[PDB]
Amino acid sequence: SKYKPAPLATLPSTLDPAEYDVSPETRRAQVERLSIRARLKREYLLQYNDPKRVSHIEDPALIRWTYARSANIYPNFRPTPKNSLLGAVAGFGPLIFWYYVFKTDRDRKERLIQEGKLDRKFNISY
Amino acid sequence: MELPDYRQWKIEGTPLETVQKKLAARGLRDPWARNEAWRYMGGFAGNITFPSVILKGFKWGFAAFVVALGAEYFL
Amino acid sequence: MNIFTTSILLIFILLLSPILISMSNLIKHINFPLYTTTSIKFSFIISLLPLLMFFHNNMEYMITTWHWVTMNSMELKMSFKTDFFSILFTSVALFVTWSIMQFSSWYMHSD
Amino acid sequence: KRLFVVKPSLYY
Amino acid sequence: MTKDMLPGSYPRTPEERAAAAKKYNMRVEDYEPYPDDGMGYGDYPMLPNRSQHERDPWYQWDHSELRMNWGEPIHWDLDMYIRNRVDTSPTPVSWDVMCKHLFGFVAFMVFMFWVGHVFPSYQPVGPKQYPYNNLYLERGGDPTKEPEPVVHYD
Amino acid sequence: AFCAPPAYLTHQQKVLRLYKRALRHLESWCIHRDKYRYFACLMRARFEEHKNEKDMMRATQLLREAEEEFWQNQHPQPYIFPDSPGGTSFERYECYKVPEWCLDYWHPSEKAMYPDYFSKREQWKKLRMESWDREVKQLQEETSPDGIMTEALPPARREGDLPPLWWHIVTRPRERP
Amino acid sequence: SGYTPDEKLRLQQLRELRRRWLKDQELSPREPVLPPSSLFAVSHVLIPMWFVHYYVKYHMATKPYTIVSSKPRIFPGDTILETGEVIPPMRDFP
Amino acid sequence: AHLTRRYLWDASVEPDPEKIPSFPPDLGFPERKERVMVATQQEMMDAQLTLQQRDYCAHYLIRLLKCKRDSFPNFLACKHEQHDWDYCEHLDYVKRMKEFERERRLLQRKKRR
Amino acid sequence: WDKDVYPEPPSRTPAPSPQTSLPNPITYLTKAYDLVVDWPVTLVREFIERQHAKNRTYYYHRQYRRVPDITECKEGDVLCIYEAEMQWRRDFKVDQEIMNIIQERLKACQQREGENYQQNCAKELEQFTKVTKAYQDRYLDLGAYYSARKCLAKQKQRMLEERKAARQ
Amino acid sequence: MLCLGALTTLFTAICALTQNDIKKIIAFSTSSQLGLMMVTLGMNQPHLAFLHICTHAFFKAMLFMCSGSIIHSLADEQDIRKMGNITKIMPFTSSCLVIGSLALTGMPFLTGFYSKDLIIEAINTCNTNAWALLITLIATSMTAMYSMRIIYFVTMTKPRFPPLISINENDPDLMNPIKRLAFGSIFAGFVISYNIPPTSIPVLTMPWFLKTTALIISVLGFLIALELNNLTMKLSMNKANPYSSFSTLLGFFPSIIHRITPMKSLNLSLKTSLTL
Amino acid sequence: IQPRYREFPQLTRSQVIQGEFLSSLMWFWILWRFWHDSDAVLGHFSYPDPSQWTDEELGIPP
Amino acid sequence: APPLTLDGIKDRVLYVLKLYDKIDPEKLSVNSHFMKDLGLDSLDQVEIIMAMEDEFGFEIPDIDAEKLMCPQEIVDYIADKKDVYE
């Protein structure tokens, strides 16, 4: 096909080779996925339509997502050469870069002022 | 809402007729032409022209122009 | 000039009147879209006067209305600069907004 | 001809 | 919620892998954790990096605007892929082709602007002439000093 | 929207979806009605030429070639119905779709402005309360032994029984509140 | 394709219930039981103008540099009111 | 056009728009009289003409402004004054074109051996 | 309003000198204004001023006597330093307002001269520049903790530099 | 400023072509006109740029009002591929739309004229980037091109709208404001251009072709767009074009930037600052 | 006001006459302004042929 | 903008179908099946659905449309979608 997918322009489904496979294995897999969807939807609709319900429907998937992205990040962190290198670089490199930028700018400005060559004309507030 | 009689809608005398002619020349027929024929029949019949659309009102504009020019000449 | 400055400030006063009316109970007793459209119309009519004066004499004004705060040798005070650009644009925008406010009463009538 | 329009409680 | 319904450490064995799939309401074959590079992912599954824009819009999703069902495992980057943010839907034109065309247009435009600057368009006319020493005083000239006279002829 | 998708689509379904999409994009390309009719007849001729293909492999191959051609010739900016997904005014009226349960919190002063509506609403709520137990029982007994389940729901089998899980399908906010 | 008998029957029952519900949505004749021209010009274009002109003339016009206007244009041949000077005419040209 | 000749033919015979006038002002002009300004600095200042407008036709622009102010609210009663001002500006433009042509002619005259 | 502090040149308005048969709408609008709007407002203001004439009271502009400067008393005498620091803060606060007055002068001159500001605001611009140099030499570069002691140190450093340059 | 305005004018004038949404076409027209104002400012003509602002407000608001009336009368349909024949089915809105479109183009002695004509004259008679000038003229042609697109596909065709018809212009709240904006689009440019004080010195001495370039290019664009639109009824299949896609998909600037920039930014904000 | 199906609707006299009036006013204004100010469209002054100015006029010495 | 009615929807649906060559205007009833009774094709049903969408200015999702096999089914689907019978 003349369409080359990209990570941000994913491959369509009608152009997907895996959508045209009729093997009983894949057919069983799809049916099992639909069965899981059906069971979850049945439970959700029962809760949703329950006339005695007096509160919102708690979402275990959402709780798991938030727990994973917050409280479970550190217990499952192991330092590695790549982790340490990335951490050091991201943490400090920007700081060193901006320190050099600001310090060179300030030093040039101060040299100008000491020599009296800086044209501070109506500067009154600083 | 009383619908107009569907017997009214025909293909003859409209561009759908030429479409049907070409399809027949290819050995095919269009079973939906009468569902579009109202767009070409009736008060929707006739072709619009860019001259007409742009110059809409030109006759009365020119009449008013002549009147105003004559008045200015008189005064 | 009294007349010129009065017109310039009255435009804003008239525009602000509908905003205040919307914070009272009168908005349920009146036809708010029509009241606002009339306010825009009268603001346009009032603004037509500074426009005429500028066309006549071509003078431009600097009107300091209120002293907000002074910040050590830099005073921040509400100031209006009414010259060619402001005077013409105010009238043009008020005309356009009058038209669009009347149009919206029909376009958004159901909403 | 005139259908009830469901609204939240704006009384409060 | 007990500690067994919550995400845990990387699954070391097929027993743990099956238990994790059961926990996440996913088929064992579909379940696939992140690489064990110790970046905190732990047991959480890896779902395809496909934006919510691509889900079926005609379906009756439990979470209507998220286009997700209740209980369905949530992508790690759901808040990046919500329908308001990053979109990954397929395109009529391939990504590289789009990039090439856009960058080519920009490069051609900038090069042609440079060419125009090199070869400016002007009229066969001399410079505008102003009186009174090129308006010396009006342009803020110093009164006491005397400018070098500039004379305009015919 | 009302029906739930199946686990998979069949070859017939895929071909029909491709046919509909191709005709819609062909209409988008040919702005005018007569031209669209002509080219739609030609497209149906192409579809019919292979309507008989008992080699279910040369059928899938034809379908894949057709899908490649469609993705090659699709309108970059096709025509979307205003209310359909992706069309202007799609979810335009979701701001005014206040769910029915919001009326529970109305102040008595506000309910006094619609005496009959809430009288009928109490009857509806009583009906829901009466039905719920029987409908959940019906679903529980209808559950298939084998795990192969579907989102399709059963109708009311006995008499005086409402279809199970009917309350949200009914009472849903109107399309244009 | 096509509705299975169960789908058709469920659709019929939901259709009946939904249509009855929509009918119940109708308001009764008494339902909204509510519980027991220069006027605009003078109200909005005159009283506020009094207030604004007062504020200007007696709080803005009395302060220094509060209202400043560009100098009026003077052309050769004009009479200044305050000083009475008559601007000399311009040179004659072809 | 001048641009075609400069950018495709010999560019050394075409004026450089920045460097006009290049040759001494008095070449081929044994008697050259200075440009004449009718309106005075004081008159232009009093009339409030913009520095862009304070050229050699300021005496016509001042008449136009005076006529507009006097005629107001009749804003169509200054067509003659405006035509006078535009014609003066056109003559100034023609003088500038003559300057450009003189520069070109002198540049191609300098093509001596 | 004191003209010496806030100089406002004399107005130079030209005579009407109409040259058309049409009526000027602005004149009639100004007449209607001077009648409807200007007169009742004037009467209300006159009544207010008449009421003010009775119940008339006076308020005075406080005067502060000069106290010993920072230079005039000893290192670590907190009493002296407090007096001198309060006096220096008063003088600094007044320098700020003088700055503001001259900036207002410059802005009003620019607006008034309009298109001739490049040539008819020379006096105001030069005043701004000179008074600006004075302000910079006095107060510029003192911390957010500026004080009489810092001002004295800055002045002494500047004087030392000037003296060294004069020697060289 | 000159280069940026010229680029914006050309880019948005291109994008306006091949747009099947009336509001989108008018928005791209607005962007093109703003690019032209930016070119005018790139030249030292601030007063002329402001004059164009004031003149353009009128007819742009009128065009948007007319499009709104059409969309309301139809069952909220904005795509022009389901309109047509509005010239006959909505005489008043169609007439106002055509007045606004001709005003947007350089029709002599309409509100647009007293700004667009002078801007084009000043562009021609000034020291400017050759490429900026050339693409500005091409965009001035493309303006009439897409105006003709709107006119043709929303007026000069057979009806493509659904069969049930419920069209009602007859409402004062609709008719009166459009009438006022039409009086504006016809006379306001003239009245203002005469009343305003002299601001800058225009250049009125130029070759006939430079003087009449505005009219000539506008008419050329009208004719070319008319021929291309007439060619649509020919029973030949329209094949996708690389340039047609570049126009339709907005030059891919949205498709690329609105996906690469936010993706990288948000991925950094999560994987680096927060997690790592 | 009457919604009609697959048929050209009925046009009130008001909208027709008002659209006609707007178009006529536009064209009257264009014709009037072109008659009175054709220079703004064609040209105000004669662009001189720079190649015809004589060397004596341009002060070109031989 | 007249609100839709059951009778109006039925009338317009039958109008569209009567304007179909493959269906003879007689032998077409609200309950007449497209394949069992009228003997139409799978592609013909898709074309009919598209014609109804064009008529009523809104789209039938493919999943819901594939099951609409009789004019009464189409009428009921349109009615349920538009919430007609208040």
Side-chain angles (χ1 to χ4, degrees), chain J residues 15-27:
Chain J
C15 284
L17 299 171
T18 70
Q19 288 291 338
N20 314 277
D21 214 270
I22 190 168
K23 281 179 76 170
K24 295 270 275 178
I25 303 165
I26 305 170

Side-chain angles (χ1 to χ4, degrees), chain H residues 27-29 76 79 83 86-87 90 93-94 97-99 101-106 109, chain K residues 33 36-37 44-48 50-62:
Chain H
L27 299 213
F29 278 126
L76 310 102
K79 290 170 185 156
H83 171 263
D86 304 301
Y87 186 53
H90 160 82
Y93 198 87
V94 172
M97 271 195 288
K98 287 180 178 178
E99 293 276 1
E101 181 53 23
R102 160 177 168 85
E103 183 96 334
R104 168 170 85 80
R105 299 261 202 75
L106 294 171
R109 182 231 203 195
Chain K
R33 277 293 111 200
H36 285 60
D37 318 327
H44 311 82
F45 313 101
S46 65
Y47 171 84
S51 163
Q52 281 154 211
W53 291 325
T54 184
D55 290 76
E56 181 257 318
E57 180 165 59
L58 281 149
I60 298 281

Side-chain angles (χ1 to χ4, degrees), chain I residues 3 56 69 74 88 105 110-111 113 138 146:
Chain I
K3 297 290 179 302
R56 176 151 281 284
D69 302 276
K74 302 176 171 299
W88 184 93
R105 282 180 170 185
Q110 201 285 342
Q111 179 65 33
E113 305 304 315
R138 286 162 82 104
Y146 44 67

Side-chain angles (χ1 to χ4, degrees), chain C residues 3 10 17 24 28 32 34 37-40 46-47 60 62 69-70 74-75 81 86-87 89-90 104 107-108 111:
Chain C
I3 184 79
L10 193 64
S17 165
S24 186
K28 314 152 201 193
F32 191 53
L34 192 69
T37 313
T38 297
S39 282
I40 303 305
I46 294 301
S47 94
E60 309 175 343
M62 152 160 131
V69 69
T70 166
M74 161 145 58
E75 311 194 288
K81 159 61 152 295
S86 170
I87 283 167
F89 183 85
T90 295
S104 40
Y107 189 92
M108 312 285 317
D111 157 23

